[PDB]
Amino acid sequence: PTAVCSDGTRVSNAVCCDFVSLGQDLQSMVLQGDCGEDAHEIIRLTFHDAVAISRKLGPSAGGGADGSMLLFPLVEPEFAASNGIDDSVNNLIPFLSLHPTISAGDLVQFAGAVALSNCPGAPRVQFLAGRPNHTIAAIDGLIPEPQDNVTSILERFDDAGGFTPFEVVSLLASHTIARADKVDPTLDAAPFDTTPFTFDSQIFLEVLLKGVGFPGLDNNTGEVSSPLPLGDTSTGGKDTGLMRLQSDFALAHDPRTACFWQGFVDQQEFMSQSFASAFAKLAVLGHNTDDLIDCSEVVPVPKPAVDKPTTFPATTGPQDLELSCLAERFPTLSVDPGAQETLIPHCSDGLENCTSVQFSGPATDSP
Ligand code: HEM
Ligand SMILES: [Ca+2]
Numbered sequence: 001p002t003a004v005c006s007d008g009t010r011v012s013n014a015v016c017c018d019f020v021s022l023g024q025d026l027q028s029m030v031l032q033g034d035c036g037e038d039a040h041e042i043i044r045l046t047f048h049d050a051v052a053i054s055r056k057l058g059p060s061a062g063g064g065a066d067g068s069m070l071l072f073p074l075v076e077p078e079f080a081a082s083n084g085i086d087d088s089v090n091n092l093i094p095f096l097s098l099h100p101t102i103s104a105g106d107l108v109q110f111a112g113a114v115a116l117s118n119c120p121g122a123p124r125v126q127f128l129a130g131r132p133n134h135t136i137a138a139i140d141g142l143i144p145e146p147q148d149n150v151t152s153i154l155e156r157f158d159d160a161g162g163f164t165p166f167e168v169v170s171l172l173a174s175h176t177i178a179r180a181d182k183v184d185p186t187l188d189a190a191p192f193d194t195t196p197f198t199f200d201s202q203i204f205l206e207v208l209l210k211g212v213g214f215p216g217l218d219n220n221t222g223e224v225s226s227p228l229p230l231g232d233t234s235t236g237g238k239d240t241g242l243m244r245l246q247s248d249f250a251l252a253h254d255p256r257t258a259c260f261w262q263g264f265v266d267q268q269e270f271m272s273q274s275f276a277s278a279f280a281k282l283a284v285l286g287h288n289t290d291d292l293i294d295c296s297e298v299v300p301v302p303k304p305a306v307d308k309p310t311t312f313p314a315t316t317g318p319q320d321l322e323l324s325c326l327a328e329r330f331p332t333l334s335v336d337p338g339a340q341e342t343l344i345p346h347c348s349d350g351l352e353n354c355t356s357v358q359f360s361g362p363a364t365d366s367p
């Protein structure tokens, strides 16, 4: 039967109401209403948790979106492909005891939904509840890495959950709010687009620009040349230059994915809706949705899309594009004014001094 929650929210099932206080606590204690570092790491964790499942290897290889990262924090977070996931894992573990009626699998996906809601332009994603509270650790080798080629990436996603090439590119819209801490051992928080706190299509445009240098070292595994490599970190600042992943470049130019990649450029609603649909599928890997309950109403309403059009960043323009898609013309877009590269802020407030919540915990990392 229907019910009304603590905060006035009408739900299809009263058990959804347990998520209201969880959302409040996730925000007050970790996310702080921001599309910042902790939000981004938690969104990354939804993927590392969910994708560790394999049709061909069978259920013993991994249970998908099952909270295995939180329940066995000494196993999967320490596999090489998940280096750095310890931060999100350690931030979420305390909520397991604070909200004991909510399974680890549900906690991971709900935290991701809440984190996304903090990012202007992100969709209000579906949230189904009821993932069982027990599982076992997945095997190693199920998480794509940035040095992987498109055939490998597409096969891994198909084997995980039957994702199509369009759905894979749609999921990679997440790199609009993504940065790298481990790819380059000399850089922290190297952003993948010029607006890492805005859920927009800048990532799609900016990967199509010609690379001209590197924000740090020039020979990291999984990294390729960036169109906007400079930052202020050589003088002690925290505004790291833009980084490009090999996998994003590869997706942008492969015949199976290039038109889907370009198709999101300056198509905000299409991008956000496409991400939402693919992400809802990701969030329930390892489950029959018949066995879950719809609690979508308790996902917060996201911050609205920004007013700003999609544009070329300062010092770039259409002459710098490397295009691969014959089926759709790249749209005419304005160029941001400026004679030098604009520093990409380290913080959503435009400054460099922001700090993030980090709980201590059992998961670890390396360099
Ligand atoms: C081919 C598939 C993918 C590859 C190779 C990949 C690779 C990466 C890499 C190398 C990083 C940087 C980690 C670091 O060094 O700190 C990263 C960050 C991130 N990834 Fe992806 N990723 C993939 C798919 C996804 C998907 C499907 C999602 C979610 C739907 C996702 C969400 C994120 C987010 C939000 C971050 C940023 C974390 C932060 O800024 O703190 N990724 N990814
Ligand atoms: Ca898992």
Ligand SMILES: [Ca+2]
Pocket (backbone or CB within 6 Å): 175, 176, 177, 193, 194, 195, 196, 197, 198, 199, 200, 201, 202, 203
């Ligand atoms: Ca962005």
